[PDB]
Amino acid sequence: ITTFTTWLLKQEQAGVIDGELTIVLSSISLACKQIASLVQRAGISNLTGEDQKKLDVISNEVFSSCLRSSGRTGIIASEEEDTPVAVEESYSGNYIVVFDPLDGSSNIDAAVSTGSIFGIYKPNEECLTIDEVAQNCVVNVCQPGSNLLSAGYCMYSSSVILVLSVGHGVYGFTLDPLYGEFVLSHEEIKIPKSGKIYSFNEGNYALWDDKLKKYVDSLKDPGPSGKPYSARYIGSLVGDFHRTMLYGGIYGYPRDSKSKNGKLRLLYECAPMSYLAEQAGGKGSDGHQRILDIQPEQVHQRVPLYVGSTEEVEKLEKFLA
Amino acid sequence: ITTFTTWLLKQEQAGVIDGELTIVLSSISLACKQIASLVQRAGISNLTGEDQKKLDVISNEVFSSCLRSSGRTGIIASEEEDTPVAVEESYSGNYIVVFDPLDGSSNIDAAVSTGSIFGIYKPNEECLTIDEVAQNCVVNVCQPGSNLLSAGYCMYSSSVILVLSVGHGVYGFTLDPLYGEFVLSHEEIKIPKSGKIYSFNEGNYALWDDKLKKYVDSLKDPGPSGKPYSARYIGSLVGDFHRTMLYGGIYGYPRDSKSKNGKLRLLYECAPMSYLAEQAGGKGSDGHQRILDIQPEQVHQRVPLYVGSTEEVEKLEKFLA
Amino acid sequence: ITTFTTWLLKQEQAGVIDGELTIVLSSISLACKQIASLVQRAGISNLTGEDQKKLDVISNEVFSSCLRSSGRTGIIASEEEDTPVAVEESYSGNYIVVFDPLDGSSNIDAAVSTGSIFGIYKPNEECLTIDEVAQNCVVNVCQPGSNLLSAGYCMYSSSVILVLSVGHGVYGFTLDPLYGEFVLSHEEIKIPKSGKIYSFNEGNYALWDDKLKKYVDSLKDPGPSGKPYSARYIGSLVGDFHRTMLYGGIYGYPRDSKSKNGKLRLLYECAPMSYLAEQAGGKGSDGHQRILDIQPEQVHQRVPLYVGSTEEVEKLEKFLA
Amino acid sequence: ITTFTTWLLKQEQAGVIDGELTIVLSSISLACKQIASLVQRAGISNLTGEDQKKLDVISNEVFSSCLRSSGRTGIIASEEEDTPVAVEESYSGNYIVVFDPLDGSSNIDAAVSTGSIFGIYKPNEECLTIDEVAQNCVVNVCQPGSNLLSAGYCMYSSSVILVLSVGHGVYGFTLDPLYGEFVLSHEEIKIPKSGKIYSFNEGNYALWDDKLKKYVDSLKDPGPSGKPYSARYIGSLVGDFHRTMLYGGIYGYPRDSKSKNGKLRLLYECAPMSYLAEQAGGKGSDGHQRILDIQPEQVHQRVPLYVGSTEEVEKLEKFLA
């Protein structure tokens, strides 16, 4: 039985990380434990069509306190219909953490699962609510194809799982409810190079490109095993990505008629997941170029995401070619 | 704050139920609490696929003990890739309970949510592993359009919820993790007469009838609001049905090439859900006739299920006409 | 496995109780679960001496809400260094409940264990903070040797246990932490007619009567088994009484120099415990006459308590003769 | 909010400890969480006196597994009515841990509280069930006035608390049941130099020395404040020591007629507690010389213990002079 704690230390042991960071990560895990409750105690406290958004808020407060020791933390607001995103800047100045508290702000999409996503970088500038300029700095300091040191997510569903990489493979820890400890439950996780599953919102089938409709239709004809693909679409980003993580296939939020540049956000959502998916033997893309290759120029910048088994994404990139 | 206990008693108070039954239902809720743990402590004990299947088993053992007081209970085996189904027969002989321990036996379908389903009848004949004849009796005593007294389900996901009807509306209780008590969180729940969401495995699109493909395609052209339908398909029966419960739309397991008569089982799965959906202002169907109208002749009898908002099912029944 | 719920119902089943009361008792158990937390979460919330007293208060609030359904409830205040005592009066008017929230108001005495005590009567008159007259009514309506229907305590220590009688023997339920349910763990509990253990504050040895010193000294000479008595004094009323409950012996709060009429209070503390100890095959006394025989004339009326194994109390009554 | 984890790391941060040790201590805390459950789930599993002893056993198994990483561990059996004691020997060979799983083996003494005690030393040569010779080695390698690096106890009662010192003051962490985390709740704890409380089994009054009876009687005459001493004696070692820890006074297990050299064991029980009491501003004695001064020659070696406020122990040492 190896806990998250043990394992963390043993990473610092093999000098993969420093103490100052072992603290940040340890602090984060707690915050996750606390948010899990929130989500289970979901509609008991809210007795005192909206519950998910009031909860986005609280979860950032939780994040804030849990790392007060390591750093100072501020909130890039929800400028449309989104989740507000917390950011911690280490007093030490060595690290910066970007924290999506809960995948979504829809009641529907969180009706069975949700989760927090985070990635950690290594700045240059003393870049220091968060007013415009104040922000942009962040964009320029968070360089996902470069200084991105570690990343992960915690899913809150039937089981609570924390998934994580520091640069040397992905590891997964199930939370033990009895004793309130994370136990390593998945060693160096590897994404099937192939999988016959696809996650898309097909209700948007008619808002897509012909290039893409051909991809999606290609999937439905059988076999040749007489066995078509399987479609599963929870509508929860962390959920759908987790299942893909373990069982392979492809997850996709494409651009369409109404959404010119996708819907998921590069820095908060896409860049962390991809980095993780690459670390596990998969590919993370925008249809044309790997998603980390990309440098965030804009601020709440959107993108198409295609991510999963390594073969399945190539097969897509080809149809969009 | 009204607990499940309080509320139960108050039902017996208004003589809606008898004591002997208030016990059965109370016993069942506990069993659910226990199975929720199992599912959370999912892959910690199993460090000592078939994580799901080994777990189907245990959950029936849990059911058995929890009602030992009220009755005697035996197991209709998994005659294939199914869940084995426990059945309790009251010593009093007044009641019979049919308990699907977990919606599925796939690792992948349970990767974020699962759940138990149950329905309770008032027999005529005494039925007493369960050998063939022994069973069939059951089919003949469980008459879902007649003696079906109460039914419900418990979902195990981000939140644990128990949903239930005794004949006078559907009520939902969230499980409170701190104090380990179910708290009434949804009063007489009503299913939107319409909803623009659809739950189908579209990977089987090419194994379907033209009648049905037309239905499904009808859904994807926009609006006229420019707003198509939404597709969400967890692959978990209880999950998908719960979301439909709250947010409306249609859930569907249709028959196809490979599966001549659907895939869900009439008595264990379909008859309970429908009864609940009717109790909440929706419709439960097989494409042609209401699903409760139907009398189980066969044993592990399958059927197509179409269930949800009242308008959305009519609209389907029409395309299959 | 028989829960408190099951068992309660089965009492109403054998018509030992009515529904309206099954509710009061069921409500009470919850309140206990909640107070247990308070006590465990003891000095975590209180990071945001005197911790015990602030907690007396909260626990009555908890009691209040938990029976809001059954009745209305008010507080007789702490006239010395005591616990304030909640009282519920059923709307139906059939029942009255007296609730000591926590045995003590000392930090020291509650450093490892504490507990709530309650007794329930059937009134003849309407009593309606609680101003003087308002109270006295209560004294006159609560007649412990008469209308006292049920009573019990819940102990909060290494294990949480709820102990209870409705008139036909004493039963004990351990609280199950995993699933948050009370499980019957002691059937019709019987107090050893003898036991070689004594619970007294011997620091007050020199404030006692000679009659009593002789009792206490009688205990310390060995055997004749060469085996003296054992002294155990937690200082926690519920704790010390519980151990006595299971393992026999004598518990004692005597009168002395400074305290002319004992220190424990007849109606709140002594009358409930004794009634329980009589129900389990023991005796509850004041040194001279059984403690229930006694009719409360005064208001916050004190008394010596000697309670435990049936032989050990007789043996005392004799030395005080 | 500082967890045990955070705080541990921050100790290794200020290089007070090494990683290899931060792991041992972290491992131990878990084992404690697990044993706490056992003790709460006390008589629910045991439905499937003698409950305490069967439990001593299990708790060592729990200890074993929880440090399997760090080292190898064996059991010095119960040579009396005692607790068997686990010992871990680090693979490193750098550290050795001695673990009393639960203070006692009596049902009575554990009826409201119990606890595990441990101390950690710094061997030279490795000892490699544990047959005699095999053991003695241990006695010679564990030198409590020398190589004893850290020590602590965990109490299992109304609250679960873990108390600990590594050499720079004593710190106390309450276990948070909701989230299953230890939270620092007592900073550098200091034992009142005086306290008017005494913990002795006075049932053995007549098996004591006159020297000692005079001490004990000295305590019972009042004041001069007119205020005598208070006696509290739970009969639980960890419990009685904990109360003393916080509220001051004296705890005592003296030698007597039947027990020539006390009853508590030097290496397992006494040497750890004292070391802790010294670290908190108190004294730990045998009546004549400080208890750590003493070098264990024998194996399951007994001793009188007098421990607590610094003045109260001196005052005793004098009467025994």
PDB file of N, CA and C in Angstrom, chain A residues 39-42 44 47 107-109 112 155-159 174 176-179 184 197-198 201-203 205-206 220 226 228-229 231-234 247 258, chain B residues 39-42 44 47 107-109 112 155-159 174 176-179 184 197-198 201-203 205-206 220 226 228-229 231-234 247 258:
ATOM      1  N   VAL A  39     -18.973  18.148  -3.388  1.00  0.00           N
ATOM      2  CA  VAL A  39     -19.700  17.565  -4.502  1.00  0.00           C
ATOM      3  C   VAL A  39     -20.607  16.450  -4.051  1.00  0.00           C
ATOM      4  N   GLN A  40     -20.267  15.748  -2.988  1.00  0.00           N
ATOM      5  CA  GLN A  40     -21.146  14.693  -2.472  1.00  0.00           C
ATOM      6  C   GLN A  40     -22.283  15.251  -1.608  1.00  0.00           C
ATOM      7  N   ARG A  41     -21.907  16.046  -0.596  1.00  0.00           N
ATOM      8  CA  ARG A  41     -22.801  16.968   0.130  1.00  0.00           C
ATOM      9  C   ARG A  41     -23.370  17.985  -0.880  1.00  0.00           C
ATOM     10  N   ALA A  42     -23.782  17.533  -2.061  1.00  0.00           N
ATOM     11  CA  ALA A  42     -24.037  18.455  -3.176  1.00  0.00           C
ATOM     12  C   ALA A  42     -25.253  19.317  -2.907  1.00  0.00           C
ATOM     13  N   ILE A  44     -27.441  18.982  -0.239  1.00  0.00           N
ATOM     14  CA  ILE A  44     -27.866  19.035   1.173  1.00  0.00           C
ATOM     15  C   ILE A  44     -27.633  20.446   1.755  1.00  0.00           C
ATOM     16  N   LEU A  47     -29.869  23.165   0.146  1.00  0.00           N
ATOM     17  CA  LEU A  47     -31.261  23.286   0.612  1.00  0.00           C
ATOM     18  C   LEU A  47     -31.411  24.591   1.424  1.00  0.00           C
ATOM     19  N   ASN A 107     -25.439  22.249 -14.814  1.00  0.00           N
ATOM     20  CA  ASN A 107     -26.041  21.272 -13.900  1.00  0.00           C
ATOM     21  C   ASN A 107     -26.129  19.884 -14.526  1.00  0.00           C
ATOM     22  N   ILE A 108     -26.568  19.864 -15.783  1.00  0.00           N
ATOM     23  CA  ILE A 108     -26.738  18.649 -16.579  1.00  0.00           C
ATOM     24  C   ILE A 108     -25.448  17.839 -16.702  1.00  0.00           C
ATOM     25  N   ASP A 109     -24.376  18.522 -17.108  1.00  0.00           N
ATOM     26  CA  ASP A 109     -23.100  17.871 -17.442  1.00  0.00           C
ATOM     27  C   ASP A 109     -22.396  17.327 -16.190  1.00  0.00           C
ATOM     28  N   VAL A 112     -23.614  13.375 -12.957  1.00  0.00           N
ATOM     29  CA  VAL A 112     -22.981  12.141 -12.440  1.00  0.00           C
ATOM     30  C   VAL A 112     -21.491  12.239 -12.203  1.00  0.00           C
ATOM     31  N   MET A 155     -10.939  13.359 -10.481  1.00  0.00           N
ATOM     32  CA  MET A 155     -12.304  13.137 -10.894  1.00  0.00           C
ATOM     33  C   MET A 155     -13.166  12.856  -9.691  1.00  0.00           C
ATOM     34  N   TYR A 156     -14.354  13.446  -9.666  1.00  0.00           N
ATOM     35  CA  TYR A 156     -15.319  13.163  -8.615  1.00  0.00           C
ATOM     36  C   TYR A 156     -16.545  12.460  -9.184  1.00  0.00           C
ATOM     37  N   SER A 157     -16.572  11.145  -9.004  1.00  0.00           N
ATOM     38  CA  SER A 157     -17.644  10.337  -9.514  1.00  0.00           C
ATOM     39  C   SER A 157     -17.806   9.206  -8.535  1.00  0.00           C
ATOM     40  N   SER A 158     -18.140   8.007  -9.020  1.00  0.00           N
ATOM     41  CA  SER A 158     -18.472   6.849  -8.174  1.00  0.00           C
ATOM     42  C   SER A 158     -17.331   6.577  -7.248  1.00  0.00           C
ATOM     43  N   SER A 159     -16.144   6.753  -7.809  1.00  0.00           N
ATOM     44  CA  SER A 159     -14.898   6.682  -7.105  1.00  0.00           C
ATOM     45  C   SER A 159     -14.275   8.038  -7.305  1.00  0.00           C
ATOM     46  N   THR A 174      -6.528   6.194  -6.193  1.00  0.00           N
ATOM     47  CA  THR A 174      -7.907   6.162  -5.768  1.00  0.00           C
ATOM     48  C   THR A 174      -7.954   6.702  -4.330  1.00  0.00           C
ATOM     49  N   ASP A 176      -9.323   6.673  -0.610  1.00  0.00           N
ATOM     50  CA  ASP A 176      -9.828   5.668   0.269  1.00  0.00           C
ATOM     51  C   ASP A 176     -10.773   6.365   1.260  1.00  0.00           C
ATOM     52  N   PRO A 177     -12.112   6.146   1.147  1.00  0.00           N
ATOM     53  CA  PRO A 177     -13.081   6.864   1.985  1.00  0.00           C
ATOM     54  C   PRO A 177     -13.020   6.622   3.490  1.00  0.00           C
ATOM     55  N   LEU A 178     -12.995   5.358   3.913  1.00  0.00           N
ATOM     56  CA  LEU A 178     -12.736   4.980   5.308  1.00  0.00           C
ATOM     57  C   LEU A 178     -11.661   5.829   5.981  1.00  0.00           C
ATOM     58  N   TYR A 179     -10.432   5.751   5.468  1.00  0.00           N
ATOM     59  CA  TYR A 179      -9.270   6.375   6.104  1.00  0.00           C
ATOM     60  C   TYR A 179      -8.854   7.730   5.518  1.00  0.00           C
ATOM     61  N   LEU A 184      -2.061   4.698  -4.338  1.00  0.00           N
ATOM     62  CA  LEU A 184      -1.613   4.456  -5.695  1.00  0.00           C
ATOM     63  C   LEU A 184      -2.333   3.226  -6.223  1.00  0.00           C
ATOM     64  N   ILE A 197     -13.651   3.354 -29.540  1.00  0.00           N
ATOM     65  CA  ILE A 197     -14.626   4.182 -28.833  1.00  0.00           C
ATOM     66  C   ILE A 197     -14.450   5.636 -29.220  1.00  0.00           C
ATOM     67  N   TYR A 198     -15.556   6.365 -29.319  1.00  0.00           N
ATOM     68  CA  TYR A 198     -15.497   7.763 -29.716  1.00  0.00           C
ATOM     69  C   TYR A 198     -16.449   8.622 -28.895  1.00  0.00           C
ATOM     70  N   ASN A 201     -20.179  15.077 -29.021  1.00  0.00           N
ATOM     71  CA  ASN A 201     -21.592  15.483 -28.984  1.00  0.00           C
ATOM     72  C   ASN A 201     -22.209  15.407 -30.363  1.00  0.00           C
ATOM     73  N   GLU A 202     -22.832  14.287 -30.702  1.00  0.00           N
ATOM     74  CA  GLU A 202     -23.317  14.095 -32.082  1.00  0.00           C
ATOM     75  C   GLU A 202     -24.586  14.873 -32.398  1.00  0.00           C
ATOM     76  N   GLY A 203     -25.168  15.522 -31.398  1.00  0.00           N
ATOM     77  CA  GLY A 203     -26.288  16.413 -31.631  1.00  0.00           C
ATOM     78  C   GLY A 203     -25.874  17.595 -32.477  1.00  0.00           C
ATOM     79  N   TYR A 205     -24.000  17.234 -35.082  1.00  0.00           N
ATOM     80  CA  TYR A 205     -23.546  16.604 -36.297  1.00  0.00           C
ATOM     81  C   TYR A 205     -23.729  17.494 -37.523  1.00  0.00           C
ATOM     82  N   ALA A 206     -24.803  18.279 -37.516  1.00  0.00           N
ATOM     83  CA  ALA A 206     -25.147  19.109 -38.656  1.00  0.00           C
ATOM     84  C   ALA A 206     -24.473  20.461 -38.624  1.00  0.00           C
ATOM     85  N   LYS A 220     -19.016   4.362 -38.047  1.00  0.00           N
ATOM     86  CA  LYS A 220     -20.256   3.634 -37.794  1.00  0.00           C
ATOM     87  C   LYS A 220     -20.465   2.386 -38.633  1.00  0.00           C
ATOM     88  N   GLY A 226     -17.524  -7.010 -38.070  1.00  0.00           N
ATOM     89  CA  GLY A 226     -18.963  -6.823 -37.854  1.00  0.00           C
ATOM     90  C   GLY A 226     -19.255  -5.963 -36.634  1.00  0.00           C
ATOM     91  N   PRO A 228     -18.953  -2.409 -35.004  1.00  0.00           N
ATOM     92  CA  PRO A 228     -18.762  -0.961 -35.139  1.00  0.00           C
ATOM     93  C   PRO A 228     -17.963  -0.368 -33.976  1.00  0.00           C
ATOM     94  N   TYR A 229     -17.843   0.958 -33.959  1.00  0.00           N
ATOM     95  CA  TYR A 229     -17.271   1.655 -32.825  1.00  0.00           C
ATOM     96  C   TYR A 229     -18.333   1.763 -31.749  1.00  0.00           C
ATOM     97  N   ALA A 231     -19.965   4.561 -29.000  1.00  0.00           N
ATOM     98  CA  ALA A 231     -20.019   5.964 -28.641  1.00  0.00           C
ATOM     99  C   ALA A 231     -20.347   6.072 -27.153  1.00  0.00           C
ATOM    100  N   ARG A 232     -19.555   6.832 -26.398  1.00  0.00           N
ATOM    101  CA  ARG A 232     -19.907   7.164 -25.016  1.00  0.00           C
ATOM    102  C   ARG A 232     -19.612   8.627 -24.800  1.00  0.00           C
ATOM    103  N   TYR A 233     -20.592   9.399 -24.336  1.00  0.00           N
ATOM    104  CA  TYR A 233     -20.408  10.827 -24.152  1.00  0.00           C
ATOM    105  C   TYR A 233     -21.118  11.305 -22.905  1.00  0.00           C
ATOM    106  N   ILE A 234     -20.369  11.341 -21.807  1.00  0.00           N
ATOM    107  CA  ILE A 234     -20.879  11.770 -20.522  1.00  0.00           C
ATOM    108  C   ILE A 234     -21.263  13.251 -20.572  1.00  0.00           C
ATOM    109  N   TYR A 247      -9.141   3.183 -21.123  1.00  0.00           N
ATOM    110  CA  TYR A 247      -9.657   2.246 -22.109  1.00  0.00           C
ATOM    111  C   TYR A 247      -9.378   2.601 -23.559  1.00  0.00           C
ATOM    112  N   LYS A 258     -21.421  27.405 -34.988  1.00  0.00           N
ATOM    113  CA  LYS A 258     -21.574  28.416 -33.959  1.00  0.00           C
ATOM    114  C   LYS A 258     -20.264  28.721 -33.234  1.00  0.00           C
TER     115      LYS A 258
ATOM    116  N   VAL B  39     -18.225   0.498  -3.990  1.00  0.00           N
ATOM    117  CA  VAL B  39     -17.951   1.138  -5.252  1.00  0.00           C
ATOM    118  C   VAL B  39     -16.924   2.230  -5.120  1.00  0.00           C
ATOM    119  N   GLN B  40     -16.837   2.875  -3.970  1.00  0.00           N
ATOM    120  CA  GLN B  40     -15.837   3.934  -3.775  1.00  0.00           C
ATOM    121  C   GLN B  40     -14.475   3.353  -3.432  1.00  0.00           C
ATOM    122  N   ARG B  41     -14.459   2.501  -2.397  1.00  0.00           N
ATOM    123  CA  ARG B  41     -13.360   1.576  -2.088  1.00  0.00           C
ATOM    124  C   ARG B  41     -13.210   0.614  -3.272  1.00  0.00           C
ATOM    125  N   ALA B  42     -13.270   1.126  -4.502  1.00  0.00           N
ATOM    126  CA  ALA B  42     -13.445   0.259  -5.678  1.00  0.00           C
ATOM    127  C   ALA B  42     -12.216  -0.591  -5.910  1.00  0.00           C
ATOM    128  N   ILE B  44      -9.179  -0.334  -4.232  1.00  0.00           N
ATOM    129  CA  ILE B  44      -8.251  -0.419  -3.080  1.00  0.00           C
ATOM    130  C   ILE B  44      -8.240  -1.837  -2.494  1.00  0.00           C
ATOM    131  N   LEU B  47      -6.782  -4.440  -4.968  1.00  0.00           N
ATOM    132  CA  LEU B  47      -5.318  -4.564  -5.063  1.00  0.00           C
ATOM    133  C   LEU B  47      -4.872  -5.898  -4.421  1.00  0.00           C
ATOM    134  N   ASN B 107     -16.548  -3.094 -17.085  1.00  0.00           N
ATOM    135  CA  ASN B 107     -15.660  -2.146 -16.437  1.00  0.00           C
ATOM    136  C   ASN B 107     -15.808  -0.735 -16.987  1.00  0.00           C
ATOM    137  N   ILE B 108     -15.856  -0.664 -18.298  1.00  0.00           N
ATOM    138  CA  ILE B 108     -15.932   0.592 -18.996  1.00  0.00           C
ATOM    139  C   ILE B 108     -17.219   1.386 -18.725  1.00  0.00           C
ATOM    140  N   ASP B 109     -18.371   0.713 -18.721  1.00  0.00           N
ATOM    141  CA  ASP B 109     -19.683   1.362 -18.505  1.00  0.00           C
ATOM    142  C   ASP B 109     -19.857   1.884 -17.071  1.00  0.00           C
ATOM    143  N   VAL B 112     -17.489   5.741 -14.395  1.00  0.00           N
ATOM    144  CA  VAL B 112     -17.866   6.924 -13.595  1.00  0.00           C
ATOM    145  C   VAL B 112     -19.162   6.803 -12.797  1.00  0.00           C
ATOM    146  N   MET B 155     -28.276   5.525  -7.259  1.00  0.00           N
ATOM    147  CA  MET B 155     -27.171   5.790  -8.166  1.00  0.00           C
ATOM    148  C   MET B 155     -25.917   6.029  -7.386  1.00  0.00           C
ATOM    149  N   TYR B 156     -24.822   5.446  -7.853  1.00  0.00           N
ATOM    150  CA  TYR B 156     -23.546   5.683  -7.229  1.00  0.00           C
ATOM    151  C   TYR B 156     -22.636   6.424  -8.185  1.00  0.00           C
ATOM    152  N   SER B 157     -22.516   7.732  -7.957  1.00  0.00           N
ATOM    153  CA  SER B 157     -21.684   8.572  -8.782  1.00  0.00           C
ATOM    154  C   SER B 157     -21.128   9.658  -7.892  1.00  0.00           C
ATOM    155  N   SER B 158     -20.971  10.887  -8.406  1.00  0.00           N
ATOM    156  CA  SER B 158     -20.341  12.022  -7.681  1.00  0.00           C
ATOM    157  C   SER B 158     -21.072  12.285  -6.396  1.00  0.00           C
ATOM    158  N   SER B 159     -22.389  12.121  -6.484  1.00  0.00           N
ATOM    159  CA  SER B 159     -23.294  12.125  -5.365  1.00  0.00           C
ATOM    160  C   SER B 159     -23.970  10.765  -5.373  1.00  0.00           C
ATOM    161  N   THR B 174     -30.691  12.458  -1.225  1.00  0.00           N
ATOM    162  CA  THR B 174     -29.254  12.481  -1.396  1.00  0.00           C
ATOM    163  C   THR B 174     -28.672  11.899  -0.134  1.00  0.00           C
ATOM    164  N   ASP B 176     -26.011  11.744   2.801  1.00  0.00           N
ATOM    165  CA  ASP B 176     -25.217  12.734   3.502  1.00  0.00           C
ATOM    166  C   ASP B 176     -23.974  12.034   4.061  1.00  0.00           C
ATOM    167  N   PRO B 177     -22.758  12.296   3.485  1.00  0.00           N
ATOM    168  CA  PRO B 177     -21.543  11.542   3.859  1.00  0.00           C
ATOM    169  C   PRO B 177     -21.042  11.708   5.303  1.00  0.00           C
ATOM    170  N   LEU B 178     -20.953  12.944   5.789  1.00  0.00           N
ATOM    171  CA  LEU B 178     -20.715  13.235   7.210  1.00  0.00           C
ATOM    172  C   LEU B 178     -21.466  12.306   8.160  1.00  0.00           C
ATOM    173  N   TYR B 179     -22.803  12.369   8.140  1.00  0.00           N
ATOM    174  CA  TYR B 179     -23.658  11.683   9.129  1.00  0.00           C
ATOM    175  C   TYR B 179     -24.242  10.369   8.640  1.00  0.00           C
ATOM    176  N   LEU B 184     -34.122  13.861   2.201  1.00  0.00           N
ATOM    177  CA  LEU B 184     -35.034  14.171   1.110  1.00  0.00           C
ATOM    178  C   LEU B 184     -34.550  15.427   0.403  1.00  0.00           C
ATOM    179  N   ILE B 197     -32.845  16.326 -25.558  1.00  0.00           N
ATOM    180  CA  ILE B 197     -31.685  15.477 -25.290  1.00  0.00           C
ATOM    181  C   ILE B 197     -32.006  14.042 -25.646  1.00  0.00           C
ATOM    182  N   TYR B 198     -31.030  13.316 -26.165  1.00  0.00           N
ATOM    183  CA  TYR B 198     -31.268  11.953 -26.555  1.00  0.00           C
ATOM    184  C   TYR B 198     -30.100  11.069 -26.160  1.00  0.00           C
ATOM    185  N   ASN B 201     -26.736   4.597 -27.937  1.00  0.00           N
ATOM    186  CA  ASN B 201     -25.436   4.184 -28.460  1.00  0.00           C
ATOM    187  C   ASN B 201     -25.392   4.322 -29.961  1.00  0.00           C
ATOM    188  N   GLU B 202     -24.912   5.454 -30.459  1.00  0.00           N
ATOM    189  CA  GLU B 202     -24.948   5.704 -31.901  1.00  0.00           C
ATOM    190  C   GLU B 202     -23.903   4.942 -32.687  1.00  0.00           C
ATOM    191  N   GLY B 203     -23.008   4.252 -31.995  1.00  0.00           N
ATOM    192  CA  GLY B 203     -22.052   3.366 -32.659  1.00  0.00           C
ATOM    193  C   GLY B 203     -22.746   2.214 -33.341  1.00  0.00           C
ATOM    194  N   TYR B 205     -25.423   2.646 -35.082  1.00  0.00           N
ATOM    195  CA  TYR B 205     -26.303   3.361 -36.008  1.00  0.00           C
ATOM    196  C   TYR B 205     -26.604   2.521 -37.231  1.00  0.00           C
ATOM    197  N   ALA B 206     -25.609   1.733 -37.637  1.00  0.00           N
ATOM    198  CA  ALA B 206     -25.700   0.949 -38.840  1.00  0.00           C
ATOM    199  C   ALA B 206     -26.322  -0.406 -38.610  1.00  0.00           C
ATOM    200  N   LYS B 220     -31.061  15.645 -35.496  1.00  0.00           N
ATOM    201  CA  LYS B 220     -29.805  16.369 -35.705  1.00  0.00           C
ATOM    202  C   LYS B 220     -29.902  17.639 -36.524  1.00  0.00           C
ATOM    203  N   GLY B 226     -32.210  27.016 -34.546  1.00  0.00           N
ATOM    204  CA  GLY B 226     -30.800  26.809 -34.886  1.00  0.00           C
ATOM    205  C   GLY B 226     -30.094  25.899 -33.891  1.00  0.00           C
ATOM    206  N   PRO B 228     -29.854  22.274 -32.429  1.00  0.00           N
ATOM    207  CA  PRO B 228     -30.109  20.840 -32.525  1.00  0.00           C
ATOM    208  C   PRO B 228     -30.414  20.214 -31.166  1.00  0.00           C
ATOM    209  N   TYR B 229     -30.547  18.892 -31.151  1.00  0.00           N
ATOM    210  CA  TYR B 229     -30.679  18.151 -29.912  1.00  0.00           C
ATOM    211  C   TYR B 229     -29.302  17.969 -29.318  1.00  0.00           C
ATOM    212  N   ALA B 231     -26.806  15.113 -27.459  1.00  0.00           N
ATOM    213  CA  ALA B 231     -26.625  13.688 -27.195  1.00  0.00           C
ATOM    214  C   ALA B 231     -25.740  13.502 -25.959  1.00  0.00           C
ATOM    215  N   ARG B 232     -26.191  12.702 -25.006  1.00  0.00           N
ATOM    216  CA  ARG B 232     -25.371  12.341 -23.862  1.00  0.00           C
ATOM    217  C   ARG B 232     -25.597  10.876 -23.611  1.00  0.00           C
ATOM    218  N   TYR B 233     -24.527  10.093 -23.578  1.00  0.00           N
ATOM    219  CA  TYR B 233     -24.652   8.666 -23.384  1.00  0.00           C
ATOM    220  C   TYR B 233     -23.527   8.163 -22.524  1.00  0.00           C
ATOM    221  N   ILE B 234     -23.808   8.071 -21.237  1.00  0.00           N
ATOM    222  CA  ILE B 234     -22.849   7.588 -20.263  1.00  0.00           C
ATOM    223  C   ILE B 234     -22.513   6.120 -20.514  1.00  0.00           C
ATOM    224  N   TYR B 247     -33.839  16.148 -16.051  1.00  0.00           N
ATOM    225  CA  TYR B 247     -33.722  17.126 -17.121  1.00  0.00           C
ATOM    226  C   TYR B 247     -34.526  16.827 -18.366  1.00  0.00           C
ATOM    227  N   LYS B 258     -27.974  -7.501 -34.353  1.00  0.00           N
ATOM    228  CA  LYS B 258     -27.452  -8.553 -33.498  1.00  0.00           C
ATOM    229  C   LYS B 258     -28.405  -8.892 -32.348  1.00  0.00           C
TER     230      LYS B 258
END
